[PDB]
Design an enzyme around this catalytic site. Structure first.
Site, short mmCIF file in Angstrom:
data_model
loop_
_atom_site.label_atom_id
_atom_site.label_comp_id
_atom_site.label_asym_id
_atom_site.label_seq_id
_atom_site.Cartn_x
_atom_site.Cartn_y
_atom_site.Cartn_z
N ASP A 1 46.94 40.60 23.77
CA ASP A 1 46.58 41.93 24.24
C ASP A 1 46.63 41.94 25.77
O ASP A 1 47.00 40.95 26.41
CB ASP A 1 45.19 42.31 23.72
CG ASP A 1 45.17 42.55 22.22
OD1 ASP A 1 46.22 42.95 21.66
OD2 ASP A 1 44.12 42.32 21.60
C1 LIG Z 1 29.35 38.59 38.58
C2 LIG Z 1 29.05 39.85 37.77
C3 LIG Z 1 30.32 40.34 37.08
C4 LIG Z 1 30.31 41.86 37.04
C5 LIG Z 1 30.77 42.35 35.67
C6 LIG Z 1 30.79 43.87 35.64
C7 LIG Z 1 32.02 44.33 34.87
C8 LIG Z 1 31.68 45.56 34.02
C9 LIG Z 1 32.27 45.38 32.63
C10 LIG Z 1 32.02 46.64 31.80
C11 LIG Z 1 32.95 47.77 32.26
C12 LIG Z 1 33.86 48.14 31.09
O1 LIG Z 1 33.53 47.87 29.99
S1 LIG Z 1 35.43 49.01 31.36
C13 LIG Z 1 36.00 49.55 29.72
C14 LIG Z 1 36.70 50.90 29.84
N1 LIG Z 1 36.97 51.45 28.52
C15 LIG Z 1 38.31 51.86 28.13
O2 LIG Z 1 39.21 51.74 28.88
C16 LIG Z 1 38.56 52.44 26.74
C17 LIG Z 1 40.04 52.54 26.47
N2 LIG Z 1 40.55 51.20 26.19
C18 LIG Z 1 41.98 50.94 26.28
O3 LIG Z 1 42.69 51.84 26.57
C19 LIG Z 1 42.57 49.55 26.01
O4 LIG Z 1 42.04 49.04 24.82
C20 LIG Z 1 42.29 48.57 27.15
C21 LIG Z 1 40.82 48.16 27.13
C22 LIG Z 1 42.61 49.22 28.49
C23 LIG Z 1 43.14 47.31 26.99
O5 LIG Z 1 44.40 47.59 26.46
P1 LIG Z 1 44.96 46.63 25.25
O6 LIG Z 1 44.63 47.27 23.92
O7 LIG Z 1 46.45 46.47 25.37
O8 LIG Z 1 44.30 45.27 25.34
#
Ligand SMILES: CCCCCCCCCCCC(=O)SCCNC(=O)CCNC(=O)[C@H](O)C(C)(C)COP(=O)(O)O
Ligand SMILES: CCCCCCCCCCCCCCCCCC(=O)OC[C@H](COP(=O)([O-])OCC(O)COP(=O)([O-])OC[C@@H](COC(=O)CCCCCCCCCCCCCCCCC)OC(=O)CCCCCCCCCCCCCCCCC)OC(=O)CCCCCCCCCCCCCCCCC
Ligand SMILES: CCCCCCCCCCCCCCCCCC(=O)O[C@@H](COC(=O)CCCCCCCCCCCCCCC)COP(=O)(O)OCC[N+](C)(C)C
Ligand SMILES: CCCCCCCCCCCCCCCCCC(=O)O[C@@H](COC(=O)CCCCCCCCCCCCCCC)COP(=O)(O)OCC[N+](C)(C)C
Ligand SMILES: CCCCCCCCCCCCCCCCCCCC(=O)O[C@H](COC(=O)CCCCCCCCCCCCCC)COP(=O)(O)OCCN
Ligand SMILES: CCCCCCCCCCCCCCCCCCCC(=O)O[C@H](COC(=O)CCCCCCCCCCCCCC)COP(=O)(O)OCCN
Lengths: 97, 111, 77, 120, 127, 536, 83, 44, 83
Positions: G39
């Site tokens: 992925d």
């Molecule tokens: C040191 C401390 C570290 C800090 C960490 C903080 C980080 C924050 C983490 C939480 C933020 C999130 O979840 S950000 C999550 C945002 N949500 C989405 O984007 C929903 C739509 N998802 C998609 O379009 C795809 O599934 C995709 C995922 C792009 C992949 O593509 P593939 O299907 O091809 O793998």
């Protein structure tokens, strides 16, 4: 590029020089080149050591002439071997040695 | 494409007709950049962009004239303290209005 | 003549591209902020000046008060 | 988030968030042993919201994660020494060829070296 | 390898230069830097000056709490359960001369007041 | 005999830096260490004559170095008990570092120039220490400043290194300006520059503040500590010398030589510096930076002890000379670790087969730093902590500083040895020759001799304190060590970030002081002389 | 040191195996990550793991351009600091 | 478990020669302890 | 202060000068610190083992003097009415 004629007069890369490292060999610096190790270095070091010891002798004479001890040492000090201006030692009680 | 101009033996001649470019003092000249040259020209001729604004007057006064005023006040205070220290009468300085004529102490006198 | 204005892209893949630029406007501090910080830091630099001023004022005031009390004592007596 | 991160497409933006988060896990750890569980936790944090399709909620998650990654930027990034920001980057940079060296400089027109005053 | 490592060369200037470009220090290697780091550009840890001032505002009262008690709240009689070191009169008189001495706090002494006024000495030379 | 050591060091500097073409890289690798070995014999003779046998000597090289009207100063050397001790410590450490640089700097282009800088650097330290008058001290002070400028910025193709050297130069310039003011005060109202007639029982506060402001520069105290952390850009042999003896200790030596300091200022500044240095060393992730912050903390202890008692000057000097040893060992071992792992970050260090000597030297130096009982550092630090009980505010801050010191020292030890291997699977190696072993043997001999000979005459003199008060520093150090081994979290992420930025002292300078400096420059030039006063 | 393609191929194939989903015969010197079953979030982990394997720092914009087994090998071969 | 098998990829970090040896960190502590024990018996 | 009178000063001025005892150390304990000083500088490196009797005696007399100081403190404090 075909190396210029004066490259023959210039010296090679030393053993300590990394093979990848490139430096311009024409540049002159008083502290030495990028990795040095000249031919005849042993004789130059011997001469430098001789000059160091001769200057040490001259400095030793000068210092001994100008070394002033105005208070008697508590005990025997090594300077008594070479300088005669050391006051006779007196201990903590006050007795002369 | 290049040749050695200098001759230590003293048999130096400038080959103005030589096909090969001499390795003269101009060989090591820095190439230079167009925008750096215009930056140098702008910075030297910064009087062209000088404009009298209230902000400019404010800055000039507050820093330059302010530092002059502060230094003059400090120097006057030091002169007053030194006059009290030395035992001299208050000296007639230029902008001080004093009804005393004391300027230079007499060496012969005991103060 | 002039140096070339074309950059070298040989090491971009190793060390990153040069696309990202600085966000600074290359402008100085505002006049109002500069006034405050000059008139704050420069007094801190001149800390001996204020110490000398304080002690001299203290000395002169004590001397004058002594003189006044002396005048009072030498008037009645 | 910087302008370059914002201009990126959604897929690459989430990829950037994951990469920066992993690097910041490396920076804030005390050893490699701390890294693996925290990396799996970040894995699960991204996997939890991958199937959301509501654009507005996804924008909220991306923005909040970007704020979190901005706040937890380490004062001291762990960078390999030979790369930009590294200790040994530029210590003794390899010197290039084609250097302009003037041989026997003082013997080029030795008598007439100096500055002249030219007049009209 | 300390010597001979690859480096990136900074691109040549291709646009009109700002007047205060002297604030940028570039030796020809790619990562040029401000004259003083933190004057402009990226901030280490993404922390502004306001954040650091607030952190210091939190710290200072806790750090200053030990010092303020002894220096201000406490008094020479109640600072310590003992008097300063007792010396023979000839030694004590010389030691009391030092403005930075430790026998100036001897409240048992009959010269305590003069010793305390000596300790709080002149700020600047009078002459 | 007394002059010989300075002659040997300056001869090494001249020979390597001006005739190094003839000598060569090997020629430096002999003439440096041999000359400093001879200087070590001379310094040992000096130490035995002056300290043990109480025989101070004055050598006047020449008179009227500056002779303008009443102002008269001479080039004279007085070896008093303080000077002999500092001379011995400095020459011992510098001989060790010169042995170290033979293998460490072999991969560096100008090894001869580096050796020459190191030897002149030591020579100027000895000129500062042995001067009989204030002007000779100023000469040595500025000499060590310029030598630090030429050594920190050794890597000229790194913008960070040259900017670090500029930082050091500017901060030290401000400090010696204050010192020159105090020097002029003391000449005017005492009649001389010599320390003998320098004595004043009562001094006005301005002179004391000027002396303290000058001292806090080299001995990096608060608001003047910015340069020490950035001084990591230089090669490892430079860091060992500057942090162990030459630069940091000079302010403490000046404060001890002339007891014009005020108790209230020194104690508060020292305790604040110790606490802040420990807190900053908590956040740091470079091996070399943690040791610099620890140097800051130890300097804070030494400055604090002056306020406590009359013996505070002796205790400060004893901690100074004890600290030079294990701190120099810590830098040299850290530098060897960096070379072997090709890395500077504590995360990627780990357990790996190595030399028993280097690991033992690191362990023993860190134990001395922590306060492990029956060690040279332990005695010199308990002499400070136990005698600081009378100053309640100072004592508390120093005890918390001991806790923090134990925590980060144990954390560094666990990360370097106990932790699993953290670096990558690549061929990395630094094979150590017998010369480096002789270096670490010299440091270990210094450490061992410190236990038997002691640091101060009143080191084991009783401080009449309850047992639970007297043995408290050990418990605080043990608790800090145990918490450090577990690698627990002590502060919230906000305060950890605050400490990682070192309190934001540099960011304040950037945003306000430097901008005001260059706005003053803008008003002076652009608005006024190239503006208002320039014709069209 | 310019590292030859054959070794770089072996080490990139070695790294790619550790994903559980990827089947040990599907990985070929010329195969895109999609056919392997990786992925986008997985490609992040593979690019990072390549960073530990060859002891290099991939600047991020190039990291996006790595989507295949082939171009990753090409990028590693191009790098003169790759170990 | 989803993701790169980081711990299996780095299972070489438990190599016998990459483990901690008490002797390297504490070379001759045991000899000093034994000598002190003998000297303790003598002194007592 | 009056209730707890100073002890007799065994060490005289010429003896303290002959031992080069600083004025800070001249605190009714000076004779014992002369003993400790002479023995410490007599044994440069074995003084910790050899010079233990003299150090013990100095510490004992210093303890007695410290008790006198605390007694003076208590007497003065009760005179002022603080306790
Ligand atoms: C040191 C401390 C570290 C800090 C960490 C903080 C980080 C924050 C983490 C939480 C933020 C999130 O979840 S950000 C999550 C945002 N949500 C989405 O984007 C929903 C739509 N998802 C998609 O379009 C795809 O599934 C995709 C995922 C792009 C992949 O593509 P593939 O299907 O091809 O793998
Ligand atoms: C300190 C406080 C901060 C200072 C600044 C504060 C604001 C300043 C306000 C003044 C101002 O705005 O000036 C702008 C103004 C210039 O106009 P502009 O808008 O810049 O452009 C017009 C030109 O075309 C401009 O064209 P241009 O570009 O070709 O000309 C440029 C020219 C333009 O410059 C000038 O024309 C005059 C330059 C000197 C001005 C004299 C001092 C004025 C300010 C001092 C007091 C300020 C306090 C407020 O500059 C020069 O090249 C000449 C300078 C070279 C000589 C340098 C001598 C320095 C002397 C004092 C320096 C000023 C003090 C700053 C540093 C202090 C150091 C101690 O200057 C003046 O008009 C001078 C006003 C004061 C003159 C003094 C009184 C004259 C006496 C007349 C007596 C009458 C006699 C009657 C008989 C007549 C029959 C013969
Ligand atoms: C006190 C009595 C005895 C005096 C002896 C002083 C010790 C030696 C004095 C020698 C003359 C001092 C001035 C030397 C010239 C100053 C320039 C210099 O020292 O170094 C030059 C070049 O060095 C030389 O060629 C000559 C140096 C020979 C020995 C220098 C010893 C250190 C100087 C002493 C400091 C002067 C004290 C002045 C203040 C008291 C430039 O060095 P870098 O800028 O670091 O660049 C070098 C290249 N690299 C980037 C790779 C580092
Ligand atoms: C309030 C002051 C109380 C303490 C005063 C001591 C410190 C004062 C300010 C110290 C500035 C000296 C530091 C310096 O040299 O600045 C630049 C040098 O650049 C400059 O030249 C900037 C000029 C600053 C010097 C003067 C500004 C401060 C002036 C103080 C007051 C201003 C006006 C007062 C009256 C004139 C280098 O800094 P970095 O970029 O961080 O390099 C460190 C290494 N590393 C890359 C790894 C991070
Ligand atoms: C149009 C152009 C001008 C417009 C803008 C001008 C704005 C500037 C005005 C403020 C300038 C700074 C303040 C100095 C002047 C204060 C008022 C003058 C009156 C005066 O002399 O009072 C003395 C001020 O203290 C003093 O002796 C001086 C203390 C301040 C100096 C130190 C602060 C800065 C330090 C930076 C270094 C500069 C000085 C270096 C030597 C103290 O009264 P007194 O007891 O002396 O009796 C003297 C009887 N009036
Ligand atoms: C242990 C002994 C003491 C150690 C040092 C302690 C220093 C304590 C000083 C800080 C505590 C009081 C701070 C003042 C209160 C301000 C609180 C909010 C801050 C704020 O809103 O503005 C800030 C002003 O900078 C400022 O606040 C600068 C004020 C600092 C006063 C000068 C004291 C020296 C400080 C040196 C170290 C402190 C670093 C952090 C201040 C940021 O300004 P901006 O950049 O956003 O402005 C916009 C550019 N147009």
């Amino acid at each position: 590029v075909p190396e210029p004629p004066y490259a023959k007069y210039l010296a090679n890369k030393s053993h300590y020089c990394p093979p990848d490292f490139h430096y311009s060999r024409e540049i002159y610096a008083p502290y030495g080149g990028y990795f040095n190790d000249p031919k005849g270095w042993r004789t130059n070091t011997a001469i430098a050591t001789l000059v160091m010891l001769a200057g040490a002798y001259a400095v030793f004479c000068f210092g001994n002439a100008r070394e002033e001890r105005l208070r008697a040492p508590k005990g025997w000090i090594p300077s008594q071997l070479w300088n005669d201006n050391v006051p006779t030692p007196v201990d903590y009680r006050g007795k002369v040695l | 494409s290049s040749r050695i101009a200098g001759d230590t033996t003293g048999k130096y001649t400038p080959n103005i007709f030589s096909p090969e470019t001499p390795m003269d003092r101009s060989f090591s000249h820095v190439p230079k950049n167009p925008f750096w040259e215009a930056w140098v020209f702008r910075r030297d001729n910064i009087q062209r962009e000088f404009v009298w604004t209230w902000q400019t007057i404010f800055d000039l006064a507050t820093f330059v004239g302010g530092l002059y005023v502060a230094m003059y006040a400090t120097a006057s205070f030091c002169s007053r303290q030194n006059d009290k220290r030395n035992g001299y009468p208050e000296r007639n300085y230029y902008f001080s209005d004093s009804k005393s004529n004391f300027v230079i102490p007499d060496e012969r006198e005991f103060y | 003549n002039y140096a070339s204005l074309k950059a070298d892209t040989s090491m971009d893949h190793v060390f990153g591209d040069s696309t990202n630029k600085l966000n600074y406007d290359f402008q100085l501090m505002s006049s109002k902020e500069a006034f405050f910080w000059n008139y704050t830091l420069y007094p801190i630099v001149g800390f001996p000046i204020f110490l000398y001023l304080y002690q001299f004022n203290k000395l002169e005031n004590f001397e004058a008060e002594i003189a006044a009390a002396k005048a009072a004592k030498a008037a009645s007596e | 988030a910087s302008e370059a991160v914002l201009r990126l497409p959604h897929k690459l933006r989430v990829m950037r968030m994951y990469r920066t988060g992993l690097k910041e896990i490396v920076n804030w750890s005390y050893g490699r042993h701390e890294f693996y569980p925290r990396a799996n936790a970040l894995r699960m944090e991204f996997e939890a919201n991958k199937e959301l399709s509501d654009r507005e909620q996804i924008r909220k998650l991306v923005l909040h994660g970007e704020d979190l990654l901005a706040r937890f930027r380490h004062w001291e990034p762990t960078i390999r020494s030979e790369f930009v920001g590294g200790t040994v980057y530029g210590v003794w940079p390899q010197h290039c060829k084609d250097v302009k060296f003037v041989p026997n400089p003082a013997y080029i027109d030795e008598f007439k070296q100096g500055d002249t005053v030219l007049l009209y | 390898a300390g010597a001979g490592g690859p480096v990136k060369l900074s691109p040549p200037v291709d646009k009109p230069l700002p007047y205060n470009y002297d604030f940028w220090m570039d030796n020809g290697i790619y990562p040029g830097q401000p004259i003083y780091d933190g004057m402009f550009g990226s901030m280490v840890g993404n922390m502004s000056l306001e954040y650091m001032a607030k952190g210091w505002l939190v710290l200072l009262p806790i750090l200053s709490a030990p010092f303020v008690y002894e220096h201000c709240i406490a008094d020479d009689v109640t600072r310590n359960p003992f008097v300063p070191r007792q010396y023979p009169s000839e030694v004590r008189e010389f030691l009391a001369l030092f403005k930075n001495g430790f026998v100036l706090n001897d409240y048992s002494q009959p010269d305590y007041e003069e010793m305390k006024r000596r300790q709080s000495g002149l700020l600047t030379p009078i002459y | 005999m007394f002059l010989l050591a300075v002659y040997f060091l300056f001869f090494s500097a001249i020979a390597n830096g001006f005739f190094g073409r003839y000598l060569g890289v090997r020629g430096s690798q002999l003439l440096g260490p041999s000359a400093l070995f001879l200087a070590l014999l001379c310094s040992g003779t000096i130490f035995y004559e002056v300290c043990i046998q109480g025989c101070s000597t004055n050598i006047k090289l020449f008179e009227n170095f500056v002779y303008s009207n009443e102002l008269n100063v001479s080039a004279s050397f007085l070896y008093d008990p303080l000077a002999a001790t500092m001379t011995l410590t400095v020459v011992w450490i510098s001989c060790a570092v010169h042995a170290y640089q033979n293998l460490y700097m072999r991969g560096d282009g100008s090894q001869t120039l580096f050796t020459s800088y190191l030897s002149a650097f030591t020579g100027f330290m000895l000129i500062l220490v042995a001067g009989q008058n204030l002007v000779m001290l100023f000469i040595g002070w500025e000499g060590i400043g310029v030598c630090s400028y030429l050594l920190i910025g050794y890597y000229g193709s790194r913008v960070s290194a040259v900017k670090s050297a500029n930082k050091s130069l500017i901060v030290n310039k401000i400090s010696d300006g204050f010192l020159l003011g105090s020097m002029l005060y003391l000449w005017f109202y005492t009649g001389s520059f010599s320390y003998c007639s320098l004595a004043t029982f009562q001094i006005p506060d301005v002179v004391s503040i000027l002396v303290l402001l000058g001292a806090i520069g080299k001995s990096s105290q608060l608001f003047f500590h910015v340069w020490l952390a950035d001084a990591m850009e230089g090669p490892t042999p430079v860091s060992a010398l500057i942090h162990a003896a030459t630069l940091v200790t000079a302010g403490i030596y000046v404060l001890c030589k002339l007891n014009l300091h005020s108790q209230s200022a020194v104690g508060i500044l020292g305790a604040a510096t110790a606490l802040m240095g420990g807190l900053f060393g908590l956040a740091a992730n470079d091996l070399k930076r943690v040791i610099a912050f620890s140097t800051c903390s130890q300097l804070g202890y030494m400055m604090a002890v002056l306020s406590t008692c009359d013996d505070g000057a002796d205790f400060a000097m004893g901690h100074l000379v004890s600290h030079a040893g294990f701190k120099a060992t810590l830098f040299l071992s850290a530098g060897l670790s960096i070379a072997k792992e090709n890395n500077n970050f504590l995360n990627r260090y780990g357990s790996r087969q190595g030399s028993p000597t280097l690991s033992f030297a690191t362990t023993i130096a860190s134990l001395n730093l922590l306060g492990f009982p029956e060690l040279g550092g332990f005695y010199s630090k308990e002499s400070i902590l136990n005698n600081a009980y009378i100053n309640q505010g100072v004592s508390i801050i120093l005890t918390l500083a001991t806790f923090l010191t134990a925590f980060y020292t144990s954390k560094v030890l666990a990360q370097l040895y106990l932790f699993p291997y953290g670096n990558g699977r690549q061929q990395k190696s630094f094979d150590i020759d017998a010369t480096t072993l002789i270096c670490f043997g010299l440091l270990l001999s210094e450490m061992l001799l410190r236990i038997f000979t002691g640091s101060s005459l009143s080191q084991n003199m009783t401080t009449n304190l309850p047992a639970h008060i007297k043995n408290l520093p050990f418990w605080v150090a043990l608790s800090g060590a145990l918490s450090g081994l577990a690698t627990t979290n002590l502060f919230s992420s906000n305060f950890m970030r605050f400490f990682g930025n070192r309190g934001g002292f540099d960011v304040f300078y950037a945003r306000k002081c430097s901008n005001v400096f260059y706005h003053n420059a803008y008003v002076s030039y652009t608005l006024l002389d190239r503006g208002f006063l320039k014709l069209y | 040191h310019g590292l030859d393609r054959d070794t770089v191929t072996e080490r990139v194939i070695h790294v790619a195996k550790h994903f559980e989903k990827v089947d040990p015969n599907k990985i070929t010197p010329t195969a895109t990550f999609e056919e392997l079953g990786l992925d986008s979030l997985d490609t992040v982990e593979l690019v990072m793991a390549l960073e530990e394997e060859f002891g290099l720092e991939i600047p991020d914009n190039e990291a996006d351009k790595i989507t295949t087994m082939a171009d990753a090998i090409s990028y590693v071969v191009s790098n003169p600091l790759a170990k | 478990k989803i993701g790169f098998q980081w711990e299996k990829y780095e299972a070489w970090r438990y190599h016998p020669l990459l483990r901690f040896n008490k002797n390297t960190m504490f070379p001759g502590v045991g000899l000093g302890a034994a000598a002190f024990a003998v000297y303790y018996v003598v002194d007592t | 202060a009056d209730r707890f009178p100073p002890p007799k000063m065994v060490a005289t001025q010429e003896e303290m000068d002959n031992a080069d005892i600083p004025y800070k150390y001249r605190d009714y304990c000076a004779h014992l610190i002369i003993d400790f000083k002479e023995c410490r500088y007599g044994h440069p490196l074995t003084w910790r083992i050899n010079c233990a009797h003299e150090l013990h005696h100095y510490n004992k007399c210093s303890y007695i003097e410290f008790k006198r100081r605390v007694a003076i403190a208590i007497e003065e404090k009760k005179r002022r009415g603080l306790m």
